[PDB]
Amino acid sequence: TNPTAFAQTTRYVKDSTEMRTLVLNLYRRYLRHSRGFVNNYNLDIPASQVRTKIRQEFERQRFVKDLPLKNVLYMKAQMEFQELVNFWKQQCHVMQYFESIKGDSFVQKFLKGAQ
Amino acid sequence: SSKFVFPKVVKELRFFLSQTGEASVPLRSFLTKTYPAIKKANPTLPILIREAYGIPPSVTARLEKGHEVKTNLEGFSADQIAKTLQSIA
Amino acid sequence: STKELTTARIKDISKPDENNLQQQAPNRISPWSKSQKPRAEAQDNVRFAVKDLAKQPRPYAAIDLIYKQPIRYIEHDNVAVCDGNGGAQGHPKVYINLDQNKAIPCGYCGLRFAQAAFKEDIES
Amino acid sequence: KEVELTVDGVKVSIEAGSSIIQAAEKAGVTIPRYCYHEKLAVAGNCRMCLVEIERSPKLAASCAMPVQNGMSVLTNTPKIKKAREGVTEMLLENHPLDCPVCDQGGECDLQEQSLRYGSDRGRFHEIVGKRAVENKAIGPLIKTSMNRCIHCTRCVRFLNDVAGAPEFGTAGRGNDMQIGTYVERNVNSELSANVIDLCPVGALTSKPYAFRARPWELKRTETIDVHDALGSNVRVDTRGIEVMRVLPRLNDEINEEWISDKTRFACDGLKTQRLTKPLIRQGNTFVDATWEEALATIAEGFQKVQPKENEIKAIVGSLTDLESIVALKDLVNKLGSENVSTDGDATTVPPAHGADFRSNYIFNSTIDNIEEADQILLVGTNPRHEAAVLNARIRKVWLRSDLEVHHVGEEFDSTFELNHLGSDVNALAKALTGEVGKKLSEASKPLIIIGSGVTETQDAEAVYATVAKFVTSNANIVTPEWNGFNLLHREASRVGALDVGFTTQSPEVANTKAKFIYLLGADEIVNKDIPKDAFVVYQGHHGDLGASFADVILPGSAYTEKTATYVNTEGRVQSTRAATNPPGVAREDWMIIRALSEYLGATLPYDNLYEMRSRLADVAPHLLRHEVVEPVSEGIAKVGFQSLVKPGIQSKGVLLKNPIENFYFTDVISKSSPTMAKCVGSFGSKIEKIKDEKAN
Amino acid sequence: TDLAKELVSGAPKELITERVARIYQEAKAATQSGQHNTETWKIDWDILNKGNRWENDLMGYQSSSDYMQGTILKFDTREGAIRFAKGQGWDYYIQEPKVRRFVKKDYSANFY
Amino acid sequence: KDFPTTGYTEVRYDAEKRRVVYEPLELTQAWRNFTVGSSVWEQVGDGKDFTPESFKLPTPAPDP
Numbered sequence A: 001t002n003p004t005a006f007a008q009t010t011r012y013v014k015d016s017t018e019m020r021t022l023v024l025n026l027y028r029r030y031l032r033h034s035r036g037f038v039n040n041y042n043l044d045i046p047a048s049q050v051r052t053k054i055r056q057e058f059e060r061q062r063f064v065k066d067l068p069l070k071n072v073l074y075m076k077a078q079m080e081f082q083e084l085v086n087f088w089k090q091q092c093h094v095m096q097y098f099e100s101i102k103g104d105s106f107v108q109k110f111l112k113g114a115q
Numbered sequence B: 001s002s003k004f005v006f007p008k009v010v011k012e013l014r015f016f017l018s019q020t021g022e023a024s025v026p027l028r029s030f031l032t033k034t035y036p037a038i039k040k041a042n043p044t045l046p047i048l049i050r051e052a053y054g055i056p057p058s059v060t061a062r063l064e065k066g067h068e069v070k071t072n073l074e075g076f077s078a079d080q081i082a083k084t085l086q087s088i089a
Numbered sequence C: 001s002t003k004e005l006t007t008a009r010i011k012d013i014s015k016p017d018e019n020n021l022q023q024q025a026p027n028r029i030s031p032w033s034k035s036q037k038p039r040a041e042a043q044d045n046v047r048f049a050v051k052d053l054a055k056q057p058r059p060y061a062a063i064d065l066i067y068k069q070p071i072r073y074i075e076h077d078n079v080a081v082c083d084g085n086g087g088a089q090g091h092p093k094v095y096i097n098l099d100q101n102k103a104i105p106c107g108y109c110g111l112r113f114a115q116a117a118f119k120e121d122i123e124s
Numbered sequence D: 001k002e003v004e005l006t007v008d009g010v011k012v013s014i015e016a017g018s019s020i021i022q023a024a025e026k027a028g029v030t031i032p033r034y035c036y037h038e039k040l041a042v043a044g045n046c047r048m049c050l051v052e053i054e055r056s057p058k059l060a061a062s063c064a065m066p067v068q069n070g071m072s073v074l075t076n077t078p079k080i081k082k083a084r085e086g087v088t089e090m091l092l093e094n095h096p097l098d099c100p101v102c103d104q105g106g107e108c109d110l111q112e113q114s115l116r117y118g119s120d121r122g123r124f125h126e127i128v129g130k131r132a133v134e135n136k137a138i139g140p141l142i143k144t145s146m147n148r149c150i151h152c153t154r155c156v157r158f159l160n161d162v163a164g165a166p167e168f169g170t171a172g173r174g175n176d177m178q179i180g181t182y183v184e185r186n187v188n189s190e191l192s193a194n195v196i197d198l199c200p201v202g203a204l205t206s207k208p209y210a211f212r213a214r215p216w217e218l219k220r221t222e223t224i225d226v227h228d229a230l231g232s233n234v235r236v237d238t239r240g241i242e243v244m245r246v247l248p249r250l251n252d253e254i255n256e257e258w259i260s261d262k263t264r265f266a267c268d269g270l271k272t273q274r275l276t277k278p279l280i281r282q283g284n285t286f287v288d289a290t291w292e293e294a295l296a297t298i299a300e301g302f303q304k305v306q307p308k309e310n311e312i313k314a315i316v317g318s319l320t321d322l323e324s325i326v327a328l329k330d331l332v333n334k335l336g337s338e339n340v341s342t343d344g345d346a347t348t349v350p351p352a353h354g355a356d357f358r359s360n361y362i363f364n365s366t367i368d369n370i371e372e373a374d375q376i377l378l379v380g381t382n383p384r385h386e387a388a389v390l391n392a393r394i395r396k397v398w399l400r401s402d403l404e405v406h407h408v409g410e411e412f413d414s415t416f417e418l419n420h421l422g423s424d425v426n427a428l429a430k431a432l433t434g435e436v437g438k439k440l441s442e443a444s445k446p447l448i449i450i451g452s453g454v455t456e457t458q459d460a461e462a463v464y465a466t467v468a469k470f471v472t473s474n475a476n477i478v479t480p481e482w483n484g485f486n487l488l489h490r491e492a493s494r495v496g497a498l499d500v501g502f503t504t505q506s507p508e509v510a511n512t513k514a515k516f517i518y519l520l521g522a523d524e525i526v527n528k529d530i531p532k533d534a535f536v537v538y539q540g541h542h543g544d545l546g547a548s549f550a551d552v553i554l555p556g557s558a559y560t561e562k563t564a565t566y567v568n569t570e571g572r573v574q575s576t577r578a579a580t581n582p583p584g585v586a587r588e589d590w591m592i593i594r595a596l597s598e599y600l601g602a603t604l605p606y607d608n609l610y611e612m613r614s615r616l617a618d619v620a621p622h623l624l625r626h627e628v629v630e631p632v633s634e635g636i637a638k639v640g641f642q643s644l645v646k647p648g649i650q651s652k653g654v655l656l657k658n659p660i661e662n663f664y665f666t667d668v669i670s671k672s673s674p675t676m677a678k679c680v681g682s683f684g685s686k687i688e689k690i691k692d693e694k695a696n
Numbered sequence E: 001t002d003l004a005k006e007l008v009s010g011a012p013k014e015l016i017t018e019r020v021a022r023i024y025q026e027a028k029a030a031t032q033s034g035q036h037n038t039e040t041w042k043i044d045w046d047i048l049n050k051g052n053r054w055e056n057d058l059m060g061y062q063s064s065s066d067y068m069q070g071t072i073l074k075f076d077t078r079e080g081a082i083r084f085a086k087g088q089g090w091d092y093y094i095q096e097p098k099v100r101r102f103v104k105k106d107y108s109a110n111f112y
Numbered sequence F: 001k002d003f004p005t006t007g008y009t010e011v012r013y014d015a016e017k018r019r020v021v022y023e024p025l026e027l028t029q030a031w032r033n034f035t036v037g038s039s040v041w042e043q044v045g046d047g048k049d050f051t052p053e054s055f056k057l058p059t060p061a062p063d064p
């Protein structure tokens, strides 16, 4: 049994410094494949917008401190990277991923029903 | 009776004090002795006393237009509490 | 009059018309339950705009059919036994007390049982 | 006094004289039972609880056999297994095959215990048949199918001992014995419907609830009752959007597994006369409107009359939640107004009990201390109709001890013996100075209960002066551990409204001719002034006299459709839990005031429920401590009672009339209930009609 | 305990910022004498103030948008329920179960 | 156990977007919880012991 393309062996990193390098290495791989993501899935946005989106998602977990949470977050990011590069996702999923979009006042929610 | 005649701007007084503990004794003693005098000067002024275990002593005074000002009374002597109520005028 | 077509009543104040499609049933005008939606109100929907109302399922009202059955009168016994008149293909067998001076229906079939000594009182 | 016994090899220790079935429960051993209930007298007529005493050749009924020291009890030997199967077979010998058509199907103790402890097969093939029993008519609330009764006498024991209604008993002998009233009459008791819960089988079932649902369909929500000031804990069962039935839940401090017939049968009024859409009056007709249009009209109507400081009047009804009371008070305060009160008809503008001291208007002794009361004085109250569950608690203490209950005021049909004294303050003055007052002074734990209808009479000031002078002059009534002064309210919003100071203590304020009246669930406004040119806004969940007197109607949610705060008569803070959503476009009652505040230029700083609840703590620190009674300290309590002592006030000698006229019509939900309409026609306003005139 | 396990659970953010869970022990039913259901601690979610249930006009079905409406977790201890709720970062509150006061009950009391 | 049986989202074909998209879950008929009808009585007892005699801690002999 040979592992699929871009498959990494799951490993639990016990060093916080080493974990930072692995995230940085994975961060560059996302940026390098940004044009490939545009070509494979036929997106309506340029590769520059994809890299902005990738940076925004990475910055959402910048201030995560717990090392056990980092390993799960890094592992799922590797799985997401493998899914995109190998064209396993359908083009509809990637289109909706970039189709993500001042809140309403109290009265505006009140008049319509709110939640 | 002295300054215990609160002005028009003061419309509601709420005393918060604990049933037990040592910090609420000065305010309980003040309320026990002075309330007949305070109510005498202000017959129609609502002076609500509410209690709860463990809360520090305080006085909430509802001024005009529903504006309330709170003043903690932890560690004060009985006389200082009387001075505190007068300053709210 | 749309008042007999949308209100639950014990009896219909008039004779049902089998060809009238606004009745609750072909043999009954008014509904027989307080929570039963009137047929006339139900058919006043956008989904019945181009639909023929005659071919819609209109089963006969069971409440009018069950009361066409004559009362069973029991002789020399104050207890009636009913199991659906089918046995294994009926309903669980139950025993009905007949001490009271009235007909008492079955809990499943709705057939009404009474003593023969009360026959004169019940019929009048 | 503890005895160390053994139940299936488990050490147990309970008080001397406890039944074996009580010790088994403490040991974690389950014994089947039909006739045993932990709130009724001991009966041994069902024989399902049989256990084997170690050294004895006879099987003892664990519900009646007293415990001994060194007693070893076996509950799972093959001999007992034979007894359980044998007793189960006898119970099901004559039982009708009615489970599909019987409302107890999914919650039947006979089904579950026969499955668990009886055999899987029956052996009754007799061709003569089972016993047939005619159905008794005992009113429109309790549906009888007496074929299903197992002769367990739970109903007889409850109605005679707990409810105090002796018209229900066992007539006949042997297999022909029939439960009922023998003669053709109804059961007259405000707690009669609890017989439905106690009946383990389908013999006694709810008539309004008949055939409509199965228990496995229903969703159970643990909330509180708002039909009286006791705050009885209930379990509301819902099936999607509709409330199906209301059941009591255990709370030994408040209701103790019982609720009144008003509480559990008024839930059908939630489907009738509901306010679902905003309404705007145009002449003599109401028309529908949007929330934006309705709130704008109120703002436009606010500027038409141009009300001044005390020209804005707010009235709060009996079923109004505490979050709305504070929100209405703050909106009223922001408009520079202080004219706030309840829809009651108190003679003195400040109520005689006042609002400065909590102890002056709460049940300071708490309901659970009635078990320890030795002397009880009732001053112008009818506990049987005002607090049905609390009335039964007094009877329980009265039966099991030498408790004496004295009554001053209008005589009423009682479930215990009342030593009546008079019907005015003059008798109360004689009693507290005569032998009656000597009993209270010598009592170790005396109780004094004032009715909520005292403040609605012209002698309200005298009554509270007489008691306060007696309470302050006697050292045993108020002690560091005991407080014998109690006020029994009949509305679930009074204590919450008083804790936040939602009442006017200035007589000049209350006499103002209002130009903008905000009715927050207020409906008893026949005797409360409403100017013909005044602009009236009603906020509530039912259409009633309050809605008819309004110009713009704002639909609110009921107590079952919102998480709301209610303070009961003993100063216990309890929070409701939402079971369903409000119908139509009705909103939460505290959000309507907040939304309207922005339309009036007085935007409240409240945005969510947590912020609103945080405001409750600011008004009163005890309003965020659920299920906890915060008592008034001994020193502060004496000052409040002393403030009630008012020399130079005359007594007019008027009747201390009971406040409740119709027991089944006390609020909008009960009035809208079709079941309560049947109760009035059958049972009557005072539950005095023994014959059913609407049953054929 | 302190770990924010909701960052990796995959559940939507609305479970934390908009929904309230109740940790409770089921009360004994008033219609039955069994107490088996009261031996376990359970967690459920408060209903949505709007959209919890509405009537579908085609067939009268009970439509809903609350995806947690039918989820009831089972726990053997109160501490386990609290630890799980804290671990998932849920906004919760505990309803303390009502305990029945013990009163001696004997057949002799029917006459004395 | 905390994951709802119906999930959080569902799919449909969007005519405007000419593709299948995920949308928040809404059920025309909500799943009815009939599991609340579980019995209030325990059904199975403590069971019978089937431990081999060679694997039970011995009981010491009684007093002399």
Ligand code: SF4
Pocket: D095, D096, D097, D098, D099, D100, D102, D103, D104, D105, D106, D108, D109, D110, D111, D148, D200, D201, D202, D203
């Ligand atoms: S009482 Fe119980 S056993 Fe008897 S018919 Fe009803 S569900 Fe069946």
Ligand code: SF4
Pocket: D148, D149, D150, D151, D152, D153, D154, D155, D156, D179, D198, D199, D200, D201, D203, D204
């Ligand atoms: S009717 Fe019900 S409560 Fe009364 S004895 Fe029969 S089974 Fe027991």
Ligand code: FES
Pocket: D032, D033, D034, D035, D036, D043, D044, D045, D046, D047, D048, D049, D050, D061, D062, D063, D064
């Ligand atoms: S429970 Fe003891 S004989 Fe009925």
Ligand SMILES: [K+]
Pocket: D104, D195, D196, D197, D198, D199, D200, D201, D202, D203, D204, D205
């Ligand atoms: K029953």
Ligand SMILES: [Zn+2]
Pocket: C082, C083, C084, C091, C106, C107, C108, C109, C110, C111
């Ligand atoms: Zn039949």
